[PDB]
Amino acid sequence: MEVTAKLRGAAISAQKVRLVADEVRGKSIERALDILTYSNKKGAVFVKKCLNSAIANAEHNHGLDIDGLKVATIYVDEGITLKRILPRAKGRADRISKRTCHITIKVGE
Amino acid sequence: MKRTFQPSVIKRKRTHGFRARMATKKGRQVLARRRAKGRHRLTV
Amino acid sequence: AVQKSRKSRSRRDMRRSHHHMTVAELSVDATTGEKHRRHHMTKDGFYRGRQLF
Amino acid sequence: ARVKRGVQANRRHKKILKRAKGYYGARSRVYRVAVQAVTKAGQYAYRDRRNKKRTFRRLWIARINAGARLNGLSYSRFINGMKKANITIDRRVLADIAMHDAATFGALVEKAKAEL
RNA sequence: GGCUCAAACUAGGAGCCGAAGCUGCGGAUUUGAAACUUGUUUUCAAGUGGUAGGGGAGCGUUGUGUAAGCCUGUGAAGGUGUGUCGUAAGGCAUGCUGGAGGUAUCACAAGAGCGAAUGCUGACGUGAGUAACGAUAAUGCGAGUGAAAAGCUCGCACGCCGGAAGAUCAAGGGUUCCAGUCCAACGUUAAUCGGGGCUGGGUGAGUCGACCCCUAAGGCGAGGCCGAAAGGCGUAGUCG
RNA sequence: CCACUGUCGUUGAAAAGCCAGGGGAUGACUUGUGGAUAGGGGUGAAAGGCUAAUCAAACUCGGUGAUAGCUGGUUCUCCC
RNA sequence: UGAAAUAGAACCUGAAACCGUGUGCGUACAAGCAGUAGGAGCCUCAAUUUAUUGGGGUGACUGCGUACCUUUUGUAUAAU
RNA sequence: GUCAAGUAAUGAAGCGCACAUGGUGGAUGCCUUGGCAGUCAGAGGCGAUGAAAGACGUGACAGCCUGCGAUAAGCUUCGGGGAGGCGGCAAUAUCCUGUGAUCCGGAGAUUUCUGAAUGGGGAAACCCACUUACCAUAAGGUAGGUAUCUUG
Ligand SMILES: [Mg+2]
Ligand SMILES: [Mg+2]
Numbered sequence A: 001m002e003v004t005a006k007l008r009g010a011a012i013s014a015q016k017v018r019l020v021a022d023e024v025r026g027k028s029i030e031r032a033l034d035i036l037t038y039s040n041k042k043g044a045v046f047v048k049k050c051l052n053s054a055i056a057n058a059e060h061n062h063g064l065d066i067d068g069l070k071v072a073t074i075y076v077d078e079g080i081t082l083k084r085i086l087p088r089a090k091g092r093a094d095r096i097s098k099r100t101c102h103i104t105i106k107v108g109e
Numbered sequence B: 001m002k003r004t005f006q007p008s009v010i011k012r013k014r015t016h017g018f019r020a021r022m023a024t025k026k027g028r029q030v031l032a033r034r035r036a037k038g039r040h041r042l043t044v
Numbered sequence C: 001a002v003q004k005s006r007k008s009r010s011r012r013d014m015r016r017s018h019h020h021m022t023v024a025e026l027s028v029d030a031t032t033g034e035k036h037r038r039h040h041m042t043k044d045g046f047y048r049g050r051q052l053f
Numbered sequence D: 001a002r003v004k005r006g007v008q009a010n011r012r013h014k015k016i017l018k019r020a021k022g023y024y025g026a027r028s029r030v031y032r033v034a035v036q037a038v039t040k041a042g043q044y045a046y047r048d049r050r051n052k053k054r055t056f057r058r059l060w061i062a063r064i065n066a067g068a069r070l071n072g073l074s075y076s077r078f079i080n081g082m083k084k085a086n087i088t089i090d091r092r093v094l095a096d097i098a099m100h101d102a103a104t105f106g107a108l109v110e111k112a113k114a115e116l
Numbered sequence E: 001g002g003c004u005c006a007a008a009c010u011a012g013g014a015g016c017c018g019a020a021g022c023u024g025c026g027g028a029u030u031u032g033a034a035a036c037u038u039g040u041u042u043u044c045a046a047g048u049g050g051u052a053g054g055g056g057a058g059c060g061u062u063g064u065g066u067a068a069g070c071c072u073g074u075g076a077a078g079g080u081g082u083g084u085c086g087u088a089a090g091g092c093a094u095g096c097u098g099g100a101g102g103u104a105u106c107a108c109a110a111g112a113g114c115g116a117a118u119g120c121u122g123a124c125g126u127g128a129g130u131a132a133c134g135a136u137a138a139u140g141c142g143a144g145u146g147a148a149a150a151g152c153u154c155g156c157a158c159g160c161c162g163g164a165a166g167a168u169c170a171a172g173g174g175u176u177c178c179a180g181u182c183c184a185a186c187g188u189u190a191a192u193c194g195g196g197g198c199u200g201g202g203u204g205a206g207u208c209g210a211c212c213c214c215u216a217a218g219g220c221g222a223g224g225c226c227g228a229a230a231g232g233c234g235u236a237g238u239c240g
Numbered sequence F: 001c002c003a004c005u006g007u008c009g010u011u012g013a014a015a016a017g018c019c020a021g022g023g024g025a026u027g028a029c030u031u032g033u034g035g036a037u038a039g040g041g042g043u044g045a046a047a048g049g050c051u052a053a054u055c056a057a058a059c060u061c062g063g064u065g066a067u068a069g070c071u072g073g074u075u076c077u078c079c080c
Numbered sequence G: 001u002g003a004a005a006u007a008g009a010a011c012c013u014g015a016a017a018c019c020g021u022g023u024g025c026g027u028a029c030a031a032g033c034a035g036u037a038g039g040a041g042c043c044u045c046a047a048u049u050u051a052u053u054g055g056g057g058u059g060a061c062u063g064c065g066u067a068c069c070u071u072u073u074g075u076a077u078a079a080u
Numbered sequence H: 001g002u003c004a005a006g007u008a009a010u011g012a013a014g015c016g017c018a019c020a021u022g023g024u025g026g027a028u029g030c031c032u033u034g035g036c037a038g039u040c041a042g043a044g045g046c047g048a049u050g051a052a053a054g055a056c057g058u059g060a061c062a063g064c065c066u067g068c069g070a071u072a073a074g075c076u077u078c079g080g081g082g083a084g085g086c087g088g089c090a091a092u093a094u095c096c097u098g099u100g101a102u103c104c105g106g107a108g109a110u111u112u113c114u115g116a117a118u119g120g121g122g123a124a125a126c127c128c129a130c131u132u133a134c135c136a137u138a139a140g141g142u143a144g145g146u147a148u149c150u151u152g
Helices: A013-025 A030-037 A042-060 B009-016 B018-023 B025-035 C008-015 D006-020 D033-068 D075-085 D091-100 D102-114
Strands: A001-010 A070-078 A082-087 A093-097 A101-108 C026-027 C035-037
Touching: A013 A030, A013 A042, A013 A070, A013 A101, A030 A042, A030 A070, A042 A101, A070 B025, A082 B025, B009 B018, B018 B025, B018 D033, D033 D075, D033 D091, D075 D102, D091 D102
Parallel strands: none
Antiparallel strands: A001 A101, A070 A101, A082 A093, C026 C035
């Protein structure tokens, strides 16, 4: 089986979290946690939180051995965008997209 | 630089206020029109 | 000064074929046994068998 | 009697996008581009139904020329020899024989060469 | 490309290639002609590129009747695949999704069909993780708290203003003031901080200001004058 | 108070600014508060200037769905 | 709990644009409206007394091939 | 086995196509509390007994909406009705109710301030009064009156 965690609504662009996700996809839980704890990217704190939640789900709700677990699948999806107005010169306005993202992690043997 | 709106309460209430509207027949028509549209603000 | 056509998603992603997160080198501290960034002290102050606090 | 266009517009656009399956980029995804690509595909297909009859005769004639020159004759003398011998075998079948049955094509060349 | 008794030129000859032309085979269709004769049947002849435009035949959609019918929780509409049928518009069946409606047939009526109108609304792209983060007065470190501290608090040091970048007001604003608590949003970064959220508190006058008494400009103005009406002016006054 | 020159800035810090210089600075000076003049009208040491980022006739609403021999667009199918 | 929770409160259905992940095939010596007519190889379902056909995915390689609308005498037009 | 010559296959930083499975988004379908056009009738006004329109209050309970007006989600009475109820968001608490509540219909009472606004004035919801009667003895309270015009 595959155990899931979801981190819907992280205040960050999915394009940014995707670089973090690409490096932990398919790795063992230990190696992936190392990569996430020593990354300098903001998206790594979100990916690490979601991965830790998925590991705890697999250990508590399903009684799996987290020693044989691995990041079976991970992907980031776009969340809801907050729309803000940015004033510019000469009385002109721009729209600002404050993008959010959904992180889905599934761990399994 | 100096802009178009320079607020003054006395000047606002004396050019646009309720008693200024009620002093004229045309101001009372302004009020009748605002009441017919149902505006929550009759006068400044 | 601006594009004459929108870029295709294929070319947009070929330009991102060089984007990559940096992965830190890690080691095990001889005294504590703990993982740390290479050439960096551990989170608790140990580097190369030497305390700092 | 107000008519909403949603359902019919949807199924109409799905027909076009279905015919545009496998096309690159916007050509399989967005309707304004897919509908031109489908029309152009039909135009090319109409033109190439005609052109394929020319291309395959081209191919048969090439293979017959090779087969006849293997036997000591050119295409323009071999076809003349067939028409003089009253042999009605078409170029499609002659090319098939030249490709897959060399001795029979040798026999046909012998008949044409005896007719000249 | 390459070509010189040519792969050039002249004059002849014979083959062959070559088009959606012509022929062959199958199918459709317009008109006309013949006969079981409103497609009932077979034929035959001539046709069938097309803008503006004229003429003919239909498809689908919403709604009315047919219909207190018929279908439908043993799964309606819609969505999404697949198969199949028709010259086309399109029809039919069916898997999955969906969960309460739909509608045969024949008539009847249209808010009846969209890719363009620098069309209208919403959503979402490309540019691009690019430019920028708003005065070049400036920060360093130690503690504290905290999930987390370059930015908060405290401390030491450094720097800046000082006819201000300090202080008191009027105008304007209106709770922003003070404390506690929170960090989603807001703050162009983070935030434990805030003029942000939430909950409480806080403004005390005979003398300060207003009100009040008085009048300026200028208003309004018993009577009065003027003017189709509306109104305009104006005395005493009354406001300001 | 003003705005002569230049650089900068021109998707600005800013729908007219900054910086460095510049002019007037007891006067036809500047400035606060209140008031007056209203659209073919006002006001103007006069540039058609200004009259709320709008001026060779403001703004709002209405006549009004102005008119447009012009430009754009005009949505299913097949047959002659 | 509920019939149902990709009915969980941004909550019926949940299209498209747009953006991910996975699987199969192709793609790093080759010049252009990106298709079309052919066509090798591979992958996958079925039959079939067993690598042959049939269906599906992909498409090395060859030929041909300058979008659409509008407006024009005439547009790939570098005209809208 | 060496060497030589020739010739395959394998590669994927990334990308394409198809399918599978999601995200976003909010179309579609169904739905309705809301609109639109009429018919047949009725009515065609409200206001100095203070209107229309408001401001400020009013609850056990913070805001808004609704009602109400210092008697303030209401008071009296007359009828209806018969078991629940204290308006909505929107519940909670204290309670009321067959000694008839909530609720509905007729009538009455109360009815702040502004506004024709009418005692004067005014930047509406404010400032300042005069006067009659009564009560208080202190710096007031209660009930009134005081605009203009027309006609008598
Ligand atoms: Mg101006
Ligand atoms: Mg839903």
